[PDB]
Design a protein that fits this description.
Family (chain B): Belongs to the DNA polymerase type-B family.
Protein name (chain B): DNA-directed DNA polymerase
Bound molecules: calcium ion
Structural class of chain A: mainly beta
Strand order of the largest sheet of chain A: 2-3-15-14-13-8
Strand content of chain B: 15-25%
Strand content of chain A: 35-45%
Function (chain B): Replicates the viral genomic DNA. This polymerase possesses two enzymatic activities: DNA synthesis (polymerase) and an exonucleolytic activity that degrades single-stranded DNA in the 3'- to 5'-direction for proofreading purpose.
Distance between the termini of chain B: 45 Å
Radius of gyration of chain A: 20 Å
Number of strands of chain A: 16
GO molecular function, one term (chains A, G): DNA polymerase processivity factor activity
Number of helices of chain B: 2
Oligomer: part of a larger assembly
Helix content of chain B: 10-25%
Strand order of the largest sheet of chain B: 1-2
Structural class of chain B: alpha+beta
CATH class of chain A: Alpha Beta
Binding site for Mg(2+) 1 (chain B): 42, 44
Order of helices and strands of chain A: HEEEEHEEEEHEEEEEEEE
Helix content of chain A: 10-25%
Radius of gyration of chain B: 23 Å
Chain lengths: 228, 69, 69, 69, 69, 276, 228, 138
DNA sequence: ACGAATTAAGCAATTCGTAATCATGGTCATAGCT
DNA sequence: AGCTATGACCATGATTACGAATTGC
């Protein structure tokens, strides 16, 4: 089995969610955060031929980047990971599947209550700006017959009304109303255009960023109110 | 005690066995080691837990007592 | 309450070295039999609950202290 | 004695000074009675003889007699 | 110490002006006295009159020397 | 303690065809320089204090020195009340062989096993008698032969209480101190063997296991005096970090002593041999 | 003096080994490790007419790269180094030669017991993997008529029985067996093709990496076992 | 309801919503707790009432009630009286540590506060902190 | 470690603070490459 | 002139042993 460079980039972006990601036979990868506030998955062209759990996935990728793309990765005689290149052989310790916090089954995300589209430039600007203004909470909501995404600050404003960022996202003719919010610990999606889906019921909600390579799912905090 | 409660120093020697010995002998004493009896002893006790000297739950079964006389 | 404090004072007295009738064997027998009794009832409750519920090797007892359980 | 031996066990001091080695034994002490009673009593008697020998060579009872007299 | 400089209880002749320890150790401090001997603690000890404790120490030392001879 | 590194050099080591001759010259100049110097010193002291009489006499008690014609150091100091001297003529008793007067180190202390004590004493003798290269070769060969020694004398032993310690099916609970974790590992391994479970307050022998072990723990602990079930014992014997214990109990004291005497117990293997 | 780019590139890699240097008259530049573990040599095309000892050699190179290549180097009037540019003058302190650890004579490398070569990219990958997987020891040995290089971590295994890296360097036709141990601290040569010479006799062993510009000599640990 | 009913924390530490006690049926269930902070006198009175009500909510109401009441008491905490929120542990062994009104070797928290109060103003002739008394610490 | 004359309900348990010691994150400083 | 990999540090986090205050069966 060989991993493409795009597969490595996707694995590194997934490594951000959790330093240790388990792998299973197939071509579908999937992970969650340690606290369960963020989940991600992807459908990759390469097919994995063996189950294995890795602890330092960032280190594993850093080592893998040092060899040619034709490297053959497989289980070893002791159950570890072995990478055979033209003239080199890399040994890596296969971690215990128990000591990796990974989602048990792929999540069947339900029907979206709200749907819109976030452009690549919008997210690309928002993520970098959030660091500049020390913005750690950003709330999507419905305003003047449209759907817009505005960023606030939380360290000094517990009322969540001090307005620091604003971004017009799109149109929405939906009678359902909502004020969802996300912390910046959950915004780890790579630059790109994503279909944004919103679901909310009872006292909890979720947001989904589906993309042409990978899908992400982010939790909505307590103040994320929805009137459906 | 009476001299103590009045804050007056009382001389002499307090312990009295030493005074009895000094008056009883006075001169230096000559002795023979044979006559004085020295008993050298040891015991053995068997128990599951470590035997406790203070409570001594277990039985006594082996005693050795060596007499020099 | 008067009678209860008297009775409860008895056990405390029986462990005081200055008590007239103090005997370490007696106090340690009282307390060790208390331990054995509470754990014995614990085991019997465990077995009876396992039988009545139909499952096995399940610990139905939350926690017990001295007489209380 | 002014001698700082690594361990003040009777076997250790007897070995250090009398240069007489204790007979090796097997198992724990508590079962030793029921395994080899002959060996048990002989060990206890040896122990007493070893303390007698350390006394004989060092000469301490004579020292305490000379002290007290 | 007890023999060469009398430290018997009754040979205390009074207090002596105490200097810092460096003065005594370096010899920079002046000579304490000629009439009575002194110590770094700073208490006047009789030179002409012999004490009782050094007398006993001298007796035991002489007996030890004779017996070692 | 006096006579450090000056009097002997001032005259010259060439004047000694035999170490005993150096000891004799030691005695000669000690008698030459001892009585008048100490006499006038303590005379000054008693006169300063103006006491009735002076009763303080010195006497050379112990003489240590590295053996002649050898790179051994002879004597060093670690800390307060910690020192070893290669004494030769203690209180006017000439010795046919050197005597290692040692105080404060692990040799007399019984914390380490008797084999470790013997090894430490031999290493001390080596550093005080012949010097670096012999210490290096002895360290190498003892490293070679340590793996074959009985685990009963080269493993750890510790008390065990509170066996549960919030077991939670192998979960440490209250930070099992590298030995209760081994107790849990041993309990898991012997599951189904029917052996006697570990009780509270029992002395348990602990053996750290090699990383990546099937046991799931880098240490295992079985009741002291007993042995791990041979079935699992063979496995635990295959996974042993003889090195960990070695660096805990043996390498650390040797390192401290060697750095306390300007020595190095691990060969550097530099290129200077080709430099000249 | 006028130092060309190639000379600076050579002696900066040497500066990585030893901070100081002792630039003698001629066309031969030499360096030794302070602890005497690696010893490097090179021949350059620049003329040298006086000798000088440099302490902060890397800063000297920073100054040189700061200024034009035709800057002239002289013995300054205050017993130090003067750098005359086309328009500016710089002063650099001259270190005492006794405070600079430098070789006193060229080392004549003995007859090589084994001869082989290693490519540039192979060594580059070896060094990157070495930093990645925390290997500190490398074992050069033989395997089925082929000379191989393996990586071992002394911290976790003092017996070197856990293979983490392995490469095949070349063929080996012979019966003399060997296993040399090299610490990663001495693998400080520049990237590039190299020829590896190995010499071993009893408890006297050494290795030499000779490239197209510079040569390096590395000591062998006493744990190495050879049968020559 | 969504209440747990009863829960435990350690040895001699437990909270139960008792409905009957020795054949005495109770009109409404009442809380029975042994060991936790609402029975420890050293915990503050206002804190005692707050966490006792929180425990009651845990045993009877459920998670959402606990979160709501925690938020409400977090809001309410700032504007409460200073005397009703403090640990009230005793003091013993006065001469172990005191110096210039500053902590000594192994000075506990309450004793450190006592010495700070000694440094506070003093000279007013107020009753001292002689051992056997109870003191609030802030 | 011999003072020597004498005295008054018990144990098991948690939890926090302090003092000692080892592992380490954020950040600063160095520096190296572009 | 700036990004970034890495050593130092400074504090921070974590674990252990011990003293202390308080319940509760
Ligand atoms: Ca009760």
């Amino acid at each position: 089995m060989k991993l493409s460079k795009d597969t490595t980039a996707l694995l590194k972006n997934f490594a951000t969610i959790n330093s240790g990601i388990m792998l299973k036979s197939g071509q579908f990868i999937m992970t969650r955060a340690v606290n369960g506030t963020t989940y991600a998955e992807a459908n990759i062209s390469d097919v994995i031929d063996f189950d294995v759990a890795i602890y330092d996935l960032n280190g594993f990728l850093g080592i893998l980047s040092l060899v040619n793309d034709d490297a053959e990765i497989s289980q070893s005689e002791d159950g570890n990971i072995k990478i055979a290149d033209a003239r080199s052989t890399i040994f890596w310790p296969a971690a215990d599947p128990s000591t990796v916090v990974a989602p048990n089954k792929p999540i069947p995300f339900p029907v979206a209550s709200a749907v819109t589209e976030i452009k690549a430039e919008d997210l690309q600007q928002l993520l970098r700006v959030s660091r500049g203004l020390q913005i750690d909470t950003i709330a999507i909501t419905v305003k003047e017959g449209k759907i817009v995404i505005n960023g606030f600050n939380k360290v000094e404003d517990s009322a969540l009304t001090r307005v620091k960022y604003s971004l017009t996202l799109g149109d929405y003719d939906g009678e359902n109303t909502f004020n969802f919010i996300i912390n910046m610990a959950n915004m780890k999606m790579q630059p790109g255009n994503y279909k944004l889906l919103l679901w909310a019921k009872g006292k909890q909600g979720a947001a989904k960023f589906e993309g042409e390579h990978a899908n992400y799912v982010v939790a909505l905090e307590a103040d994320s109110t929805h009137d459906f | 005690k009476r001299m103590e409660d009045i804050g007056l120093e009382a001389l002499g020697m307090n312990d009295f066995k030493l005074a009895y010995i000094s008056d009883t002998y006075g001169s230096e004493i000559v002795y023979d080691r044979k006559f004085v009896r020295v008993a050298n002893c040891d015991i053995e006790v068997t128990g599951d837990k470590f035997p406790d000297p203070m409570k001594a739950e277990y039985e006594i079964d082996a005693i050795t007592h060596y007499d020099s006389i | 309450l008067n009678r209860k404090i008297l009775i409860n004072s008895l056990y405390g007295a029986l462990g005081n070295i200055h008590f007239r009738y103090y005997d370490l064997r007696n106090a340690t027998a009282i307390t060790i039999f208390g331990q054995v009794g509470i754990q014995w009832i614990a085991r019997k409750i465990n077995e009876y609950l396992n039988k009545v519920c139909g499952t096995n090797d399940e610990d139905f007892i939350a926690a017990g202290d001295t007489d209380s359980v | 004695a002014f001698t700082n031996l690594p361990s003040f066990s009777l076997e250790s001091v007897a070995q250090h000074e009398t240069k007489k080695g204790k007979l090796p034994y097997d198992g724990p002490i508590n079962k030793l009675r029921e395994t080899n009673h002959q060996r048990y009593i002989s060990y206890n008697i040896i122990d007493v003889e070893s303390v007698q020998a350390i006394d004989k060579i060092r000469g301490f009872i004579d020292l305490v007699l000379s002290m007290s007299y | 110490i007890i023999r060469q400089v009398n430290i018997s209880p009754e040979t205390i002749r009074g207090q002596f002006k105490v200097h810092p320890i460096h003065e005594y150790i370096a010899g920079t401090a002046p000579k304490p006295s000629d009439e009575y001997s002194c110590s770094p603690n700073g208490w006047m000890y009789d030179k002409h009159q012999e004490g009782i404790i050094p007398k006993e120490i001298a007796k035991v030392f002489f007996q030890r020397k004779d017996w070692k001879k | 303690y006096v006579c450090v590194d000056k009097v002997i050099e001032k005259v010259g080591l060439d004047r000694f065809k035999e170490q005993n001759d150096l000891v004799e010259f030691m005695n000669q100049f000690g008698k030459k320089k001892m009585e008048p110097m100490i006499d006038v010193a303590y005379r000054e002291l008693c006169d300063y204090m103006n006491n009735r009489e002076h009763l303080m006499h010195m006497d050379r008690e112990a003489i240590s020195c590295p053996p002649l014609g050898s790179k051994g150091v002879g004597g060093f100091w670690k800390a307060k009340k910690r020192y070893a001297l290669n004494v030769y003529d203690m209180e006017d008793k000439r010795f046919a062989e050197p005597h290692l007067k040692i105080m404060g180190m692990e040799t007399q202390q019984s914390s380490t096993p008797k084999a470790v004590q013997e090894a430490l004493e031999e290493s001390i003798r080596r550093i005080l008698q012949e010097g670096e290269e012999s210490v290096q070769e002895y360290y190498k060969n003892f490293e070679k032969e340590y793996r074959q020694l009985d685990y009963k004398v080269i493993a750890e032993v510790k008390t065990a209480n509170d066996i549960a310690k919030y077991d939670d099916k192998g979960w440490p609970g209250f930070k099992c101190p590298f030995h209760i974790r081994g107790v849990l590992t041993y309990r898991r391994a012997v599951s189904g063997l029917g052996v006697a479970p570990i009780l509270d307050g029992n002395k348990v022998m602990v053996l750290p296991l090699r990383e990546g072990n099937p046991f799931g723990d880098k240490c295992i602990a079985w009741p002291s005096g007993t042995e791990l079930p041979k079935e699992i014992r063979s496995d635990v014997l295959s996974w042993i970090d003889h090195s960990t214990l070695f660096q805990k109990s043996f390498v650390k004291p040797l390192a401290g002593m060697c750095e306390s005497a300007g020595m190095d117990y691990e060969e550097k293997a530099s290129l200077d041999f080709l430099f000249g």
